[PDB]
Every structure is written in structure tokens, then in C-alpha cells.
Amino acid sequence: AAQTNAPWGLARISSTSPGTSTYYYDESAGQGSCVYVIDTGIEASHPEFEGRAQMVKTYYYSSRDGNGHGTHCAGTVGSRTYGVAKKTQLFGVKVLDDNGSGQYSTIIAGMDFVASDKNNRNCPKGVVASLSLGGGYSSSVNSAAARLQSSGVMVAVAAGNNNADARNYSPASEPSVCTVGASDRYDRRSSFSNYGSVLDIFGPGTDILSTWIGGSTRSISGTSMATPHVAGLAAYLMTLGKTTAASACRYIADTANKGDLSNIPFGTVNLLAYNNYQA
């Protein structure tokens, strides 16, 4: 399949080169997979989700996304126009309040929730979790992320936006998950992107168009935007049978575009997520 005039990040993840505008992907499109978006919620009523999104948990007075961040991330995973995996099932877990804040005990509860809740869902092709959030290092947050991964979920986490070593942030610093840095449309490391040995992969993260609350769209930037490209890519590859939740981060790194990015500090991987789709 070919989507013309796609957002640049979608075009990038199906290309060996920067500077193109068509997203190429197998029509299976993540059908039969599931992605949990652990964030501020998802506006499931957005036409872009086509009935494939739903809220499954909140820790606040409402499950509504009053912020937008979670809706945007979900759109990059799986919206019809803006998403990588256009037929995946999207499940929202609101661990962050409408101000974007979440206590670590709530984030941990939400990760343990997903590890259990997947057993209540139909995801024959596999399960992914996208965590575009974090804070300072916490062993308990990292352990929660490690348990979620161990339970059979492909966990993708944002590296953070401090232009610093991700080793000092959580869940970014948990080794066993897939820690995602951000790039821009000219194949530069995004200026804000964290880096370091704990990064597994980069994805598009600067000036990413996606869904927003109120049935709208907008372009924003962050490692938060890179993470759902990788989460969506994992769901897509799982549907194709190319990998599994335990192996997807390795598979994505194995099959990535190598050496394309600039301003990658010495000791950080130079790997950009790539679907290797050949019509």
C-alpha cells in the first residue's frame, strides 16, 4: 500500500532515504495486534480512530484526554491518516492527569494493569505498550517496565527531552525495554533528544502531525512522538509474523537504517526505525 503526502515521519520509516513523502506499508496494517497508549488518555471518538480506540483504564476522575498528548501519540501509532499501524486496536490507559502529571505509584499501577489486562483482550498477533512519559531515575518504575516486557508486551519508552544521557531517567533507563530517541526530517538527532548507551533506536520526533483533542490535528515534537512510531512499527511487524513481543526491539534494531543520523554522540546507536517494506 502507498499513502501519498503522508506525514514525513511515516514516509521516513518506510524509506532508506530522507526527503520523501509517501508511506509504503503492507495492507495488513497491524490488524489483530493491540497497542496500549499509557499517557493522558485518548479521545477515542476522534474520526481518525474509526472505532478502533477505547479507554480501558483511568486513575483520575475521568478517562477523557483533557491534555492532548495521549491522543497525539495514539494517532501516530494507529490513526488512519497519521498512524503507522492503521488497523491496530488502541487501548488507552490514563496515568497522567490533564496537567500531564502522574505520580510514580500511578504509573507503576498502570504498567501492571496492562500486563494483566492484555489477558482480557483479543490480540492474536501480539501486544505493544507505548510509554511517552517519564521522570528521574526510579528503580521501582524501571522494574515495573521490566515486568511489563517480561509478561509478553513489547514495551517502547521515550528517552526523554533533556538533551542528556537517558541513564538518569525512568522508564527510559530500564535496559530490557525499547528506549526511543528522536530525529528530525533531515536525519539529525532532534535537538532535545536524550542519548546514551541505553537507547535502542531512533524514530521521527520533530514536527510530527497527528490527532489532537476536539477532533482536531496538530504538529508537536518530542521523544514522545518518536516512541509511537516504534510502537506502531512493532505492532505492524508482529501482524506480519516477522517478530514477537520479546524479540521486536532487537528485530527493529537489526533491520534499522544504519548510519543515517547526524549529531549522534559517540557511544549512542545510529539506528533509525525502518519497516523494510518492499512492494
Binding site: 491534555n67 495521549g70 497522567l96 500531564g100 502522574g102 512519559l133 517519564g134 521522570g135 521515550a158 527531552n161
Partner: peptide, 4 residues
């Protein structure tokens, strides 16, 4: 935490 905060959103990224």
C-alpha cells in the same frame, strides 16, 4: 512523571 510528565509527558514526553
Amino acid at each position: 512523571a510528565a509527558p514526553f
